[PDB]
Design a protein around this ligand. Structure first.
Ligand code: O3M
Ligand code: CL
Ligand code: CL
Ligand code: CL
Ligand code: CL
Ligand code: MN
Length: 340
């Protein structure tokens, strides 16, 4: 039967099933007030799927100049054409190669750049903004979005949305690297998976993806989405409560020191955006500091709600197109205040 919601992370994470149901706020606000993330499935079924294809992005925008990042070593690839990224999104034999001659796992940096999404892609902008879940929270003029209503004593989000485009991580060694490193934001955010690209050429990569999900501490209900429903998994997230941020900074200072980094005793390893918590570091955070996170697999059409002040990291299982919008809920506005 079709139901309003279910629970992931062994009862710790709300999953809403109908992205446009006007009754969702009744389910959402109790979990949100506690500082928990929330997942909403099914947003892909509301979108014009022809607007979100990698081939359309290459055809329409391919002559723009951009920078990429090699996810395996953090090296910047400067001043290339955006088609050089998009044409290798799913076809491995078209990817830019590293010195060792392997195809690179690449992230497209800051594209569209700054606040330019609305001006460069007005039809995409309309399609996404009109179909965001929890619209009183997430729409620029929503009654529970304080983004446009606050004085300069608060840090306001930029005008969005923002696009996040990167290849999938492939090997056993890649399991220890992030697409986006551990960091926190002072605004709330909703992040929608609009396209998952399962590649070809090295097409038969199905078992390292299951081992990544399993080692990432993903729940059994999450594994039933793949095996029973054949949903396409895009990315593995770890999210931590805002109240656990200082204990995470203590762990990463101790590890920085063990590894011969020479940081002052006050430095901020979360703001630095330089760490990915692999299986070893997550176990150590739990055993040594008592801190547990939410391990979330974001499938095609899933919208992840990230509370302000919550440390989070992202590991792409396949090639992903994500679009995220920032907002300021009254529940979490304290995290963007500039005093005390
Ligand atoms: O795509 C769909 C997914 C689930 C449903 C099922 N209904 C059940 C009633 C209800 C009440 C409150 C909030 C949500 C719901 C969802 C319908 C469509
Ligand atoms: Cl909070
Ligand atoms: Cl457009
Ligand atoms: Cl709402
Ligand atoms: Cl990063
Ligand atoms: Mn972020």
């Amino acid at each position: 039967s079709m139901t309003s919601h279910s629970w992931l992370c062994d009862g710790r994470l709300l999953c809403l099933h109908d992205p446009s149901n006007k009754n969702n706020w009744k389910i959402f606000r109790e979990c949100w007030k506690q500082g928990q993330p929330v997942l909403v499935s099914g947003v892909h079924k509301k979108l014009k799927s022809e607007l979100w294809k990698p081939e359309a992005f290459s055809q329409e925008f391919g002559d723009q100049d951009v920078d990429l990042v090699n996810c395996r070593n953090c090296a910047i690839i400067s001043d290339v054409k955006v088609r050089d990224f998009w044409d290798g999104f799913e076809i491995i034999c078209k990817r830019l190669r590293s010195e060792d001659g392997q195809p690179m796992v690449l992230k497209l940096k800051d594209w569209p750049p700054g606040e330019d999404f609305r001006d460069m892609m007005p039809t995409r902008f309309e399609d996404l903004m009109e179909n965001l879940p929890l619209p009183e929270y997430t729409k620029r003029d929503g009654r529970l979005n304080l983004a446009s209503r606050l004085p300069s004593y608060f840090v306001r989000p930029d005008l969005g949305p923002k696009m996040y485009n990167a290849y999938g991580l492939i090997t056993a060694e890649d399991r220890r690297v992030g697409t986006t490193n551990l960091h926190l934001d002072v605004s709330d955010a909703v992040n929608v998976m609009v396209y998952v690209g399962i590649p070809i050429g090295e097409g038969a990569h199905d078992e390292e993806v299951l081992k990544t999900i399993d080692e990432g501490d993903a729940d059994e209900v999450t594994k039933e989405r793949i095996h029973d429903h054949k949903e396409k998994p895009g990315a593995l997230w770890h999210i931590y409560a805002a109240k656990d941020a200082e204990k995470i900074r203590e762990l990463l200072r101790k590890v920085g020191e063990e590894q011969g980094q020479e940081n002052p005793p006050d430095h901020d390893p979360i703001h630095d955006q330089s760490w990915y918590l692999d299986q070893t570091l997550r176990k150590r955070l739990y055993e040594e500091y008592g801190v547990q996170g939410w391990a979330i697999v974001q499938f095609l059409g899933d919208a992840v709600f990230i509370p302000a002040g919550a440390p989070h990291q992202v590991h792409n299982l396949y090639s992903c197109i994500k679009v995220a919008e920032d907002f300021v809920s009254p529940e979490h506005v304290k995290h963007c205040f500039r005093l005390t």
